[PDB]
mmCIF file of C-alpha atoms and ligand atoms in Angstrom:
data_model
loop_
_atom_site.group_PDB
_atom_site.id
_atom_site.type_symbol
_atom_site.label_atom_id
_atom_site.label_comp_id
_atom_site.label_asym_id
_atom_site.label_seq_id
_atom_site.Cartn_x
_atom_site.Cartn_y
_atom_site.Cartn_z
ATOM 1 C CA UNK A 205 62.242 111.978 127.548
ATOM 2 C CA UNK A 206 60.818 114.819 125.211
ATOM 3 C CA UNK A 207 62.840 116.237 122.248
ATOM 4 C CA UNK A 208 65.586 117.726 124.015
ATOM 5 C CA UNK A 209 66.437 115.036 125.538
ATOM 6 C CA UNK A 210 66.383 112.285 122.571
ATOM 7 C CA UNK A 211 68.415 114.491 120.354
ATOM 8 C CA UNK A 212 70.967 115.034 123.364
ATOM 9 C CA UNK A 213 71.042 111.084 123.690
ATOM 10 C CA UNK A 214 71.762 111.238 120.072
ATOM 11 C CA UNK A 215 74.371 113.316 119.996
ATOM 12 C CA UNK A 216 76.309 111.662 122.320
ATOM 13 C CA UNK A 217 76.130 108.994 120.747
ATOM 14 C CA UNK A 218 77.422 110.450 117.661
ATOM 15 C CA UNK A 219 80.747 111.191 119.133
ATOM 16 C CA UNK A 220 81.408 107.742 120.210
ATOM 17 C CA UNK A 221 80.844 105.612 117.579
ATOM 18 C CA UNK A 222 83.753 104.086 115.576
ATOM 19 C CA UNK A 223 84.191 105.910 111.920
ATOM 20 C CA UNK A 224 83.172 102.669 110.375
ATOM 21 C CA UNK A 225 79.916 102.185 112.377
ATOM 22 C CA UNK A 226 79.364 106.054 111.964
ATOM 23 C CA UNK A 227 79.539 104.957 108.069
ATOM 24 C CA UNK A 228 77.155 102.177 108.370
ATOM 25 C CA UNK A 229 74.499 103.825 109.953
ATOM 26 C CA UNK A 230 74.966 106.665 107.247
ATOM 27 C CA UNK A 231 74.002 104.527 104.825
ATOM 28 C CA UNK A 232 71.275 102.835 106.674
ATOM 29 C CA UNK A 233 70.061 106.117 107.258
ATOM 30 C CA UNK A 234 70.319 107.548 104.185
ATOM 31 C CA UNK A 235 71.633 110.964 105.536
ATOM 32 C CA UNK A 236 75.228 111.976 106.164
ATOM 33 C CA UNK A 237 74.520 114.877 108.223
ATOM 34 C CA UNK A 238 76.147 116.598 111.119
ATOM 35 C CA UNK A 239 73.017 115.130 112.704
ATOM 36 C CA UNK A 240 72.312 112.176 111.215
ATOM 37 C CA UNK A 241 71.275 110.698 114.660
ATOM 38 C CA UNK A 242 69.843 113.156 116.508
ATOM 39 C CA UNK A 243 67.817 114.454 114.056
ATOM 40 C CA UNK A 244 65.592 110.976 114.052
ATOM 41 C CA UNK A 245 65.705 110.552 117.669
ATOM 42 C CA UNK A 246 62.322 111.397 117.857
ATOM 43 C CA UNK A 247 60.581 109.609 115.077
ATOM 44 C CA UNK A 248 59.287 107.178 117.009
ATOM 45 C CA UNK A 249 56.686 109.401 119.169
ATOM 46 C CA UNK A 250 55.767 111.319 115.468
ATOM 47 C CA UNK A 251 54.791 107.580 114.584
ATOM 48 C CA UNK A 252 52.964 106.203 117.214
ATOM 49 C CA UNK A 253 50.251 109.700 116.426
ATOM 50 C CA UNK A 254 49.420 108.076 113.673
ATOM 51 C CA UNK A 255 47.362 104.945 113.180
ATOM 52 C CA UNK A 256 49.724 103.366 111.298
ATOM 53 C CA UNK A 257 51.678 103.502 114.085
ATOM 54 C CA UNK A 258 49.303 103.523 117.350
ATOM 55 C CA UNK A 259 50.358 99.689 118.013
ATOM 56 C CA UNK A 260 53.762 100.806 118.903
ATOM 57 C CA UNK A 261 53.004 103.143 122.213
ATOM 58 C CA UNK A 262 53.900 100.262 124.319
ATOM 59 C CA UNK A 263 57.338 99.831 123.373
ATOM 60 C CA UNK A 264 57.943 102.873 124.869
ATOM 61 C CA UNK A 265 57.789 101.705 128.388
ATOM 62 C CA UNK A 266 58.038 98.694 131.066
ATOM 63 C CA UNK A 267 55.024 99.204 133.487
ATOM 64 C CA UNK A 268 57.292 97.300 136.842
ATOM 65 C CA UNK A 269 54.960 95.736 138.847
ATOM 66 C CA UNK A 270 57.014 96.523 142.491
ATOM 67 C CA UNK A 271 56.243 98.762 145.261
ATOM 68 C CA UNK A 272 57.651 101.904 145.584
ATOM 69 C CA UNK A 273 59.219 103.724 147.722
ATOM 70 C CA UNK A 274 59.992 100.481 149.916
ATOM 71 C CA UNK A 275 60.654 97.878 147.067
ATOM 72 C CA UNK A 276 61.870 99.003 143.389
ATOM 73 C CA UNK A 277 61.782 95.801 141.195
ATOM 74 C CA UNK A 278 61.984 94.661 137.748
ATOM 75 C CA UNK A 279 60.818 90.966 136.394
ATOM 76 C CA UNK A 280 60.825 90.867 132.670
ATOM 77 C CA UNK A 281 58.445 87.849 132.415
ATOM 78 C CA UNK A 282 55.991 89.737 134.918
ATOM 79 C CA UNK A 283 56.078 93.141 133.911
ATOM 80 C CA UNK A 284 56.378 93.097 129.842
ATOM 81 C CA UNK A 285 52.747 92.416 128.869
ATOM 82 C CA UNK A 286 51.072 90.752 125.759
ATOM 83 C CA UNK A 287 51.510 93.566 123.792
ATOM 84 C CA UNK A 288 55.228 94.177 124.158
ATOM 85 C CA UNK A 289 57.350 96.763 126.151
ATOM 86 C CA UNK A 290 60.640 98.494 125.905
ATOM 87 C CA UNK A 291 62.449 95.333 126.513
ATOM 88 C CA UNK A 292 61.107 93.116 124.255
ATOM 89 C CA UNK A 293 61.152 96.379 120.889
ATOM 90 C CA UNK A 294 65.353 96.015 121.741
ATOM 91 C CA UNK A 295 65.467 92.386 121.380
ATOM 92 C CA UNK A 296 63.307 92.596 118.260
ATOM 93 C CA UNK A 297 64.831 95.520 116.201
ATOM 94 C CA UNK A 298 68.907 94.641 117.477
ATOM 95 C CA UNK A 299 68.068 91.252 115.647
ATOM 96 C CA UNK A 300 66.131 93.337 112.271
ATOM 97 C CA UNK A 301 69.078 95.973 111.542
ATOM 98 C CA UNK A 302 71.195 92.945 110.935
ATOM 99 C CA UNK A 303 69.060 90.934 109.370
ATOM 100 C CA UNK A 304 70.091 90.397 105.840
ATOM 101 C CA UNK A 305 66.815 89.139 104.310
ATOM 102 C CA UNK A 306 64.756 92.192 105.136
ATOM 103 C CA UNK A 307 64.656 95.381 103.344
ATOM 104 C CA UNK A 308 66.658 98.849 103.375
ATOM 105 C CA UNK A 309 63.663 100.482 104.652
ATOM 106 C CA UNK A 310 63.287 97.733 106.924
ATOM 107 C CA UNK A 311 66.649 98.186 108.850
ATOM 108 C CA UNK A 312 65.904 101.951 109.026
ATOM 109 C CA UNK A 313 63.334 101.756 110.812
ATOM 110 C CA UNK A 314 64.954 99.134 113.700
ATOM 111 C CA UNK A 315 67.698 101.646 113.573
ATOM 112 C CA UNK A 316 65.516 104.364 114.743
ATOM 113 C CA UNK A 317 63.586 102.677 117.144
ATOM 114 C CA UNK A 318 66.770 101.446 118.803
ATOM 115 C CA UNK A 319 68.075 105.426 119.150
ATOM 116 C CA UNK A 320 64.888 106.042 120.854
ATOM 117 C CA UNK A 321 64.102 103.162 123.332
ATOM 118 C CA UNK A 322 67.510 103.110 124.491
ATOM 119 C CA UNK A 323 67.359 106.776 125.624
ATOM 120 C CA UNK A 324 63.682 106.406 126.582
ATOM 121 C CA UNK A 325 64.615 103.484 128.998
ATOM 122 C CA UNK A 326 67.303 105.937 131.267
ATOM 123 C CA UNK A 327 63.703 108.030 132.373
ATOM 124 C CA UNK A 328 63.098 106.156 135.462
ATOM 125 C CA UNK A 329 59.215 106.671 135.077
ATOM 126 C CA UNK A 330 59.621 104.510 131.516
ATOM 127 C CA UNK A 331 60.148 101.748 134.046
ATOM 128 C CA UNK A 332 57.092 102.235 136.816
ATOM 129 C CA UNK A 333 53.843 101.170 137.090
ATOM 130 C CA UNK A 334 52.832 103.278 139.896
ATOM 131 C CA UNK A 335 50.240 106.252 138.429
ATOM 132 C CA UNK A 336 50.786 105.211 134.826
ATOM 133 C CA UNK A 337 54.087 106.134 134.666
ATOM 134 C CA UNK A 338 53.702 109.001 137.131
ATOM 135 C CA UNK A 339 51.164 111.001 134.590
ATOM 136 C CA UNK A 340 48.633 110.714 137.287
ATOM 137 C CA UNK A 341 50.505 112.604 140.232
ATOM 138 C CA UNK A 342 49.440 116.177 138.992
ATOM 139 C CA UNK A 343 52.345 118.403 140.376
ATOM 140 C CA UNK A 344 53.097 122.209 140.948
ATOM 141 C CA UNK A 345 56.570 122.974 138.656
ATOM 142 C CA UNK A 346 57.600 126.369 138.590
ATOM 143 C CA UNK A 347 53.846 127.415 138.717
ATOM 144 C CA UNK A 348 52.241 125.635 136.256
ATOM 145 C CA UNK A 349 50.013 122.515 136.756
ATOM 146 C CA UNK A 350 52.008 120.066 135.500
ATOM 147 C CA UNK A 351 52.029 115.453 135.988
ATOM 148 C CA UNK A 352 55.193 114.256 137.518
ATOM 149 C CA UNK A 353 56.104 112.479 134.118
ATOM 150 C CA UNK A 354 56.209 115.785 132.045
ATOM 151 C CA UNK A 355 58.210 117.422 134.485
ATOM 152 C CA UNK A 356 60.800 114.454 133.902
ATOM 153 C CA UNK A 357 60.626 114.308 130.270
ATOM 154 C CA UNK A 358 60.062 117.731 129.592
ATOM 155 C CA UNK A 359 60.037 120.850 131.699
ATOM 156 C CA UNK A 360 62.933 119.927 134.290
ATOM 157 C CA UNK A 361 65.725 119.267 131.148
ATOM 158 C CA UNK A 362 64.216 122.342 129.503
ATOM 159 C CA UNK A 363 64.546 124.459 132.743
ATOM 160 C CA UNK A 364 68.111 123.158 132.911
ATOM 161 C CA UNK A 365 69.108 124.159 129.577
ATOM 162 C CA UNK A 366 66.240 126.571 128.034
ATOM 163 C CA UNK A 367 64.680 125.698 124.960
ATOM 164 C CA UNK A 368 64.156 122.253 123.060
ATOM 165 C CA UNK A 369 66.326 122.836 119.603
ATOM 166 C CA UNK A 370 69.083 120.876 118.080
ATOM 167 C CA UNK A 371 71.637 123.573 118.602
ATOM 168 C CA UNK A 372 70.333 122.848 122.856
ATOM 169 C CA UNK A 373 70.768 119.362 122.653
ATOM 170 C CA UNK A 374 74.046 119.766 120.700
ATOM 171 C CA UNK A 375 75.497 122.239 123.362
ATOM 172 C CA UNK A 376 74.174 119.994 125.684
ATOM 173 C CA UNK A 377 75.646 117.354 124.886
ATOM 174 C CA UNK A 378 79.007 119.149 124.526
ATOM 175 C CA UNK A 379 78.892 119.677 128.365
ATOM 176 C CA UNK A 380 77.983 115.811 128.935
ATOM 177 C CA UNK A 381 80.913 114.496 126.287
ATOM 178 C CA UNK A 382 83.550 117.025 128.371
ATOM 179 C CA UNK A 383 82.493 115.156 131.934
ATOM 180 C CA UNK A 384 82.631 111.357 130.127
ATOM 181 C CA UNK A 385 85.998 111.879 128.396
ATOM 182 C CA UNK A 386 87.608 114.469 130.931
ATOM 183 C CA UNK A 387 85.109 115.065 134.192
ATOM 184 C CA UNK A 388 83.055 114.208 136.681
ATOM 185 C CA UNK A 389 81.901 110.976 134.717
ATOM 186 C CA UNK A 390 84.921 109.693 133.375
ATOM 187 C CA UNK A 391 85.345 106.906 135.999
ATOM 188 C CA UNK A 392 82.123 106.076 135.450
ATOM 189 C CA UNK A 393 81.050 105.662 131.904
ATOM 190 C CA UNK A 394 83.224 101.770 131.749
ATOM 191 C CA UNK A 395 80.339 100.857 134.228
ATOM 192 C CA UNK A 396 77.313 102.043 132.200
ATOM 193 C CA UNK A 397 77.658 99.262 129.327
ATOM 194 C CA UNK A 398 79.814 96.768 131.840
ATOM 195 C CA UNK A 399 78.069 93.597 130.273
ATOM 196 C CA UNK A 400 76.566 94.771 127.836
ATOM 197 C CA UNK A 401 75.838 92.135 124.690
ATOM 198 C CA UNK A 402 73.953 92.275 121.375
ATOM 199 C CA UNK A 403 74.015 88.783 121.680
ATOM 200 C CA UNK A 404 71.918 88.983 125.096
ATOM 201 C CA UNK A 405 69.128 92.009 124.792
ATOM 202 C CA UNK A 406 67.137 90.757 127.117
ATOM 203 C CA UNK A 407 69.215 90.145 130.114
ATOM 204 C CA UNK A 408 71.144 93.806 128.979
ATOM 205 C CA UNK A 409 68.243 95.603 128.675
ATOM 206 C CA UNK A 410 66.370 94.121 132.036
ATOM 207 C CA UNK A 411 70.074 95.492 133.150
ATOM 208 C CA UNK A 412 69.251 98.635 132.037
ATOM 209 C CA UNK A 413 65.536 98.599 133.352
ATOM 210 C CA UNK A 414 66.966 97.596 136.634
ATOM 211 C CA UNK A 415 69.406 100.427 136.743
ATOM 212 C CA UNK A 416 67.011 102.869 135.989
ATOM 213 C CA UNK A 417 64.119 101.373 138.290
ATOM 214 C CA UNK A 418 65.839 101.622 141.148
ATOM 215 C CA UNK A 419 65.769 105.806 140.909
ATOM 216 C CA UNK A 420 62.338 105.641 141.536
ATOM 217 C CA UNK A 421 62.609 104.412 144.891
ATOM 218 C CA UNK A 422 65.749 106.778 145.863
ATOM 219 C CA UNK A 423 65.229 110.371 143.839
ATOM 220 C CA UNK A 424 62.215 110.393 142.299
ATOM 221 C CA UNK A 425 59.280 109.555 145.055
ATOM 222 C CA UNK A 426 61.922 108.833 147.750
ATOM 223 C CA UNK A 427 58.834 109.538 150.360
ATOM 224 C CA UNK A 428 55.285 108.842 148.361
ATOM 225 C CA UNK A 429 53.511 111.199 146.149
ATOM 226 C CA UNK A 430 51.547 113.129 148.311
ATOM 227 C CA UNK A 431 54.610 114.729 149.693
ATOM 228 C CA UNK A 432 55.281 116.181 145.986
ATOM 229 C CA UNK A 433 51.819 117.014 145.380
ATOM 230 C CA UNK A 434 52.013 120.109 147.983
ATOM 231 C CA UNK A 435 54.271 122.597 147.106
ATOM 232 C CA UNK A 436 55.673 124.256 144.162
ATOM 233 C CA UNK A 437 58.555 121.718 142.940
ATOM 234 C CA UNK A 438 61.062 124.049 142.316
ATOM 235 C CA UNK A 439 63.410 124.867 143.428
ATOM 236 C CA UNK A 440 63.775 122.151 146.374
ATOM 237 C CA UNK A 441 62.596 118.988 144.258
ATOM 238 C CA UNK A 442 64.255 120.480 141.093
ATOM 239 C CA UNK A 443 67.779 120.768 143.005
ATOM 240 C CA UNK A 444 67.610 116.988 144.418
ATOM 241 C CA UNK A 445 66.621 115.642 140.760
ATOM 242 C CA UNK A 446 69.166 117.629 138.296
ATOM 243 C CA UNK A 447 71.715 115.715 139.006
ATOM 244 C CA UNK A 448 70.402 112.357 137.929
ATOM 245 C CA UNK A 449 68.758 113.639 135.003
ATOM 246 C CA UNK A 450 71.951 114.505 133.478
ATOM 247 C CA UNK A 451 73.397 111.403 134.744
ATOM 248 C CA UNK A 452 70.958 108.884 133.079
ATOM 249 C CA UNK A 453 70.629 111.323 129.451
ATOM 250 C CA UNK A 454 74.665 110.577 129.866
ATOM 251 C CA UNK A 455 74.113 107.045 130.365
ATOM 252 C CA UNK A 456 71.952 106.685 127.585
ATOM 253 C CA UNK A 457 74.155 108.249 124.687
ATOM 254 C CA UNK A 458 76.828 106.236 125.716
ATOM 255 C CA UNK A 459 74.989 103.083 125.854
ATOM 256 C CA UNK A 460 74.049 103.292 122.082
ATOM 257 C CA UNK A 461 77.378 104.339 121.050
ATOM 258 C CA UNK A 462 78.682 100.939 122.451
ATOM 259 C CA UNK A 463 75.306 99.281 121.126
ATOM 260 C CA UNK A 464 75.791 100.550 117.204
ATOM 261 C CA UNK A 465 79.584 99.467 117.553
ATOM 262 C CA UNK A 466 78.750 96.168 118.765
ATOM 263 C CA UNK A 467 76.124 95.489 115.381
ATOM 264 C CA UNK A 468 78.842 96.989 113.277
HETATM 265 C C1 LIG B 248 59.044 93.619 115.443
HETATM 266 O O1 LIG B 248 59.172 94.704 114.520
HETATM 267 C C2 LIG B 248 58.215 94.691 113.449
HETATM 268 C C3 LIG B 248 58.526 95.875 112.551
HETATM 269 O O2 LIG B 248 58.189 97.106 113.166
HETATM 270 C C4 LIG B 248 56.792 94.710 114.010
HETATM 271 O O3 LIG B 248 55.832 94.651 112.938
HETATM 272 C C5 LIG B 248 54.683 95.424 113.023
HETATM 273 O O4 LIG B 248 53.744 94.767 113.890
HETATM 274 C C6 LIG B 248 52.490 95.473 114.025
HETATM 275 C C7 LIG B 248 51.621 94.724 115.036
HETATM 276 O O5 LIG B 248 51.604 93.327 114.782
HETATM 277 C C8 LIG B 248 51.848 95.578 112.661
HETATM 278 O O6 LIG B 248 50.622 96.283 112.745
HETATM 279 C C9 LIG B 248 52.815 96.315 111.743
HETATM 280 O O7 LIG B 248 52.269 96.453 110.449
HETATM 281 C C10 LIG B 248 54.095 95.529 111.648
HETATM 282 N N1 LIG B 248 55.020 96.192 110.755
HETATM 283 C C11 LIG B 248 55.842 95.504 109.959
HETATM 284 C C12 LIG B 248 56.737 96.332 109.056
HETATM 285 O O8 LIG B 248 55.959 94.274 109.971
HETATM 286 C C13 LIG B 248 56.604 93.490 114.878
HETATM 287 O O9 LIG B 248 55.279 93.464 115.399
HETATM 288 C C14 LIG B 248 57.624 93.559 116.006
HETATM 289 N N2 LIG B 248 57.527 92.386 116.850
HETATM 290 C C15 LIG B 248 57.637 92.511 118.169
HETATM 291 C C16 LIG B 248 57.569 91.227 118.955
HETATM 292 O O10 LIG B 248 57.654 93.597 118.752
HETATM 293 C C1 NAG B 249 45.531 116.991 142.108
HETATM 294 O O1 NAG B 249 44.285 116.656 141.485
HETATM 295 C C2 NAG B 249 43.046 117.158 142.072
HETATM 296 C C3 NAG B 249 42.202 117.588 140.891
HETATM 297 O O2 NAG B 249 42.820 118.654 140.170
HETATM 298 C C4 NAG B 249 43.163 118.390 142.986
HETATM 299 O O3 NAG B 249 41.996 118.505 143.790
HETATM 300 C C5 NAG B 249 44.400 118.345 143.849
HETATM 301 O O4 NAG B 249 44.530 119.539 144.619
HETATM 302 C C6 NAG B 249 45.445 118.271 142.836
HETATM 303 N N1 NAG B 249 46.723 118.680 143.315
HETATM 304 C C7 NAG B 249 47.110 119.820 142.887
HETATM 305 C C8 NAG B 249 48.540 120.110 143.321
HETATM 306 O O5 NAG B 249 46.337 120.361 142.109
HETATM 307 C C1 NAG B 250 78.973 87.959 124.281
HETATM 308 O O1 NAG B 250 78.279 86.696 124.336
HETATM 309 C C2 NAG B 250 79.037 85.508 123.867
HETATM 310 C C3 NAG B 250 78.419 84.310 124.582
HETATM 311 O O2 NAG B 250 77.212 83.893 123.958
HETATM 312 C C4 NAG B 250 80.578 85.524 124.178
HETATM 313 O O3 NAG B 250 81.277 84.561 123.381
HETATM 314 C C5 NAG B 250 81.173 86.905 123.996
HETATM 315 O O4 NAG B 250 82.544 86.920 124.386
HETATM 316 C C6 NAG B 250 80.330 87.745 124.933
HETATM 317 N N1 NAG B 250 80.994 88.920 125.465
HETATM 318 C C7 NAG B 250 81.246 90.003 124.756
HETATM 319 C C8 NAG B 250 81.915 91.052 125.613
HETATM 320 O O5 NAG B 250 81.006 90.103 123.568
HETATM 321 ZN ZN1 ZN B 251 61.133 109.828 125.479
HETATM 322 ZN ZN1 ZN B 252 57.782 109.871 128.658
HETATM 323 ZN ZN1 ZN B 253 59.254 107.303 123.597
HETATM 324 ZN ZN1 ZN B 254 86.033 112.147 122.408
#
């Protein structure tokens, strides 16, 4: 996702964590803000523009290995890589915010890189090999020449909601908190983090992969690429995809609610 849709993560988040663990991360954070959360959720793309940080891009993703649209698959041992994925950076920085011999600024930084790969992970082309990721299908969205991956992270949510501020993603994630607590989602949510263990990151998070994976097979390149690379997107491809995007930005907020209350 782009910025609307990490600070949206974020801010559901924020209204599910316990007082205690909302108190904790405070501190770790350093800020006591009304967005204390959301307003870090994208640090982690700032940093890997740098090259301090260039290492990092990696983390980002899990390029599956499978076969889409007949066989969505994911196989942690298979598709991580020697330089690390998405998979790996959760079972690495769960393990640093709680460890007590590293620094302050230590822990704040595995706190921030776990609010972003655990929203970045719900974007079903975080989890695909196919085209890098999707970037190489070049797609016609609402009349600009766009790459299937953009339209995901970016231009769909912002079509959806119109613009990419905090006061969006907060109103945003207003609507999404309403459907989880008293909607459309409430029977739902228990099933999103069903499982879920800080004490197991890998097998959660291949979990989460998994769950996400299998979108790219169903909604997002149901029948190949070249049947998305001939007409204008919207508002046909737009109205079959919506619906899931809100669903897995959902999924993610409430996923590191649990996740921060479980480390508390
Ligand atoms: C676990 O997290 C640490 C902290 O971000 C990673 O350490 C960085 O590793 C890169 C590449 O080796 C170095 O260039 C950075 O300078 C390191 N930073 C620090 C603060 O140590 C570490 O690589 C991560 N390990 C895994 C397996 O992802
Ligand atoms: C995709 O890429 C090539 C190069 O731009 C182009 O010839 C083809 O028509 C493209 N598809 C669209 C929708 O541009
Ligand atoms: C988490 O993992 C450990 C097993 O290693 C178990 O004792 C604990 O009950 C598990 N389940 C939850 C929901 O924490
Ligand atoms: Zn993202
Ligand atoms: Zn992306
Ligand atoms: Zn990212
Ligand atoms: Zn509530």
């Amino acid at each position: 996702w782009g910025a609307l849709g990490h600070a949206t993560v974020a801010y559901v988040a924020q209204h599910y964590v316990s007082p205690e663990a909302a108190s904790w991360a405070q501190g770790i954070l350093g800020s006591s803000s009304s967005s204390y959360l959301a307003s870090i959720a994208s640090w982690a793309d700032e940093y890997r523009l740098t090259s301090a940080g260039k290492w990092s891009a990696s983390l980002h993703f899990i390029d599956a290995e499978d076969n889409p649209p007949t066989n969505c698959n994911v196989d942690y041992e298979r598709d991580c890589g020697s330089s690390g994925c998405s998979i790996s950076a959760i079972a690495n920085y769960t393990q640093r915010v709680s460890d007590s011999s590293l620094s302050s600024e230590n822990h704040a930084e595995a706190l921030r890189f776990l609010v972003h790969f655990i929203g970045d992970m719900t974007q079903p082309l975080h989890d695909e090999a196919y085209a890098v990721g999707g970037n190489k299908i070049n797609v016609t969205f609402d009349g600009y020449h766009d790459n299937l991956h953009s339209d995901w992270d970016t231009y769909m949510p912002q079509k959806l909601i119109g613009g990419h501020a905090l006061s969006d993603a907060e109103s945003w994630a207003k609507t999404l908190v309403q459907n989880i607590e008293s909607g459309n989602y409430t029977a739902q949510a228990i099933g999103w983090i069903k499982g879920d263990n800080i004490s197991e990151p890998i097998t959660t998070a291949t979990r989460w992969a998994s769950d996400a994976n299998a979108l790219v097979c169903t909604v997002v390149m149901p029948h190949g690429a070249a049947a998305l690379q001939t007409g204008d997107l919207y508002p046909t491809y737009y109205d079959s995809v919506i619906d899931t995007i809100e669903l897995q930005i959902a999924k993610g907020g409430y996923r590191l609610a649990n996740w921060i209350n479980e480390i508390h």
